[PDB]
Amino acid sequence: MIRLGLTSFSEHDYLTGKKRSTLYEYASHLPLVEMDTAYYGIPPKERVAEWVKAVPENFRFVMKVYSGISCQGEWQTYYASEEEMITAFLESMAPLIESKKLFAFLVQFSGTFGCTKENVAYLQKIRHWFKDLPIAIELRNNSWYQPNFVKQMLQFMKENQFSLVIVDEPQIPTNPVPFYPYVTNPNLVLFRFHGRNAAGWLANDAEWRKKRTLYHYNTQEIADLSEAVLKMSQEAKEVGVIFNNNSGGDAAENALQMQKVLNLSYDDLNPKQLD
Amino acid sequence: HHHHMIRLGLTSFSEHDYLTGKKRSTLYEYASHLPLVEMDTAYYGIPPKERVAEWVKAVPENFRFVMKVYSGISCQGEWQTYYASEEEMITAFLESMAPLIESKKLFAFLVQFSGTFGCTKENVAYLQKIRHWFKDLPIAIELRNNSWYQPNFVKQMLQFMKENQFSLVIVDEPQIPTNPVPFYPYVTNPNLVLFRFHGRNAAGWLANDAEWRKKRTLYHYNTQEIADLSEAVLKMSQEAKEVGVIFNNNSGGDAAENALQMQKVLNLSYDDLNPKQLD
Ligand SMILES: [Cl-]
Ligand SMILES: [Cl-]
Secondary structure (H helix, E strand, O other), X not given: OEEEEEEOOOOOHHHXXXXXXXXXXXXXXXXXXXXOHHHXXXXXXXXXXXXXXXXXXXXXXXXXXXXXXXXXXXXXXXXXXXXXXXXXXXHHOHHHHHOOOEEEEEEEOOOOOOOOHHHHHHHHHHHHHOOOOXXXXXXXXXXXXXXXXXXXXXXXXXXXXXXXXXXXXXXXXOOOXXXXXXXXXXXXXXXXXXXXXXXXXXXXXXXHHHHOOOOOOXXXXXHHHHHHHHHHHOOOOEEEEEEOOOOOOOHHHHHHHHHHHHOOOOOOOOXXXXX | OOOOEEEEEEEOOOOOHHHHOOOOOOXXXXXXXXXXXXXXXXXXXXXXXXXXXXXXXXXOOOOEEEEEOOHHHHOOOOHXXXXXXXXXXXXXXXXXXHHHHHHOOEEEEEEEOOOOOOOOHHHHHHHHHHHHHOOOOOEEEEOOOOOOOOOOOHHHHHXXXXXXXXXXXXXXXXXXXXXXXXXXXXXXOOOOEEEEEOOOOOOOOOOOOOOHHHHOOOOOOOHHHHHHHHHHHHHHHHHOOEEEEEEOOOOOOOHHHHHHHHHHHHOOXXXXXXXXXXX
């Protein structure tokens, strides 16, 4: 099975018709979402249970971990230890964990997170922090993908059962990772498309925040990306896909375009109308 | 003849429905009530030169801005994210704030550091690096780690600020059992002072609590507390030319009232913008 999803469930009016949509409404169209809620602050267990209750049996969640864990944030800010930060996170996510609706905890690392002895150790630290949970590592630094590291890194990922996210980001003259279809964990793969707005990037441009995921994958690009998704589904059990190119609002459209190209069905929630 | 002057302000201008009446308030509407405001817009991302100019154009001649610097500069963020060098990140920031600087409506660039930013040789170096970056501009430094305020550092530190013309922010935060900074009313820069009242919600603090995000600035100063804070400001205004005060205790919406409550106590006036009955 191949699950196509989007980041955020409320901001996809193409998918649902309404400007702000509910998770229930969302899960009447796709069987997958990424949620970056916890990234900015670990939510209460009760609200995580609201999400679980709002979706089908077949539905899955890509849950982005707290920035304190992926190192953009600081554990010190609200927690007395790195250990207690994880404890807080896992206690918050228990409802999602126990429900079997977790696709994987996404651990997106900064662009500055490069291939060093420390960082490799930290990746092992994360393995230990998330006992036997599905962890998806998104590297955004081509240093890991250099000829002298690639093969040993991929091996590292396999050993630690890490599902290395397959990333399609704009190939800016910095350190963007390549679109490298490869299954590190056969039990689950994760694609993440951020658009290819290479043109539109300027050095020292603050608006790159908005432009970096402003893209409408054309009919050709979707065909090529689909072929990759399909090729990894041969080598993997679960295969997740998250379209993140939504600065223009194109995410939902491009995802359903791929659904057609991959020819996929649905057993989601259902519609109604009253209030 | 210029007299030393006091300004009471708040963080952001829109959500203060108390002193405006409207749920969302404009900067113009805000600037018909108080002479000062802090804006944290740049902290999350450096805005365009154009929008900064709009702010300047929407306020009186004697209105002042406390402009919180980009997170990449105070180190909560990474300069790498959008810039080719620490240097170009500063160029980008100062080109953006060009209108605000040239208007003479800038009170100070606020540089708030993390709680993890304690007293270190490397940290002191970065402060001097900041001094360089901001040439001859007003810089208010807010430290949030008591390591700087220990007996073996505090005095040496205060001199460091004086010598680098830094206006060390007088902080008033919840005195949690962690590394909170004490209320230390002291003028490091006689040309400008800056208070920042974050509240005193020590009770309500839980270790490993994520909701401390909202609880930490959730407080309503009582008349006794306002009087105590007022006396502090009155003391510093005698030693300083310009004194700023930013009420940041607005998780419950109380900042506005507490600020105006202090205004009555300090007994202050205004000749800023003017209200209107149209929209
Ligand atoms: Cl991103
Ligand atoms: Cl704060």
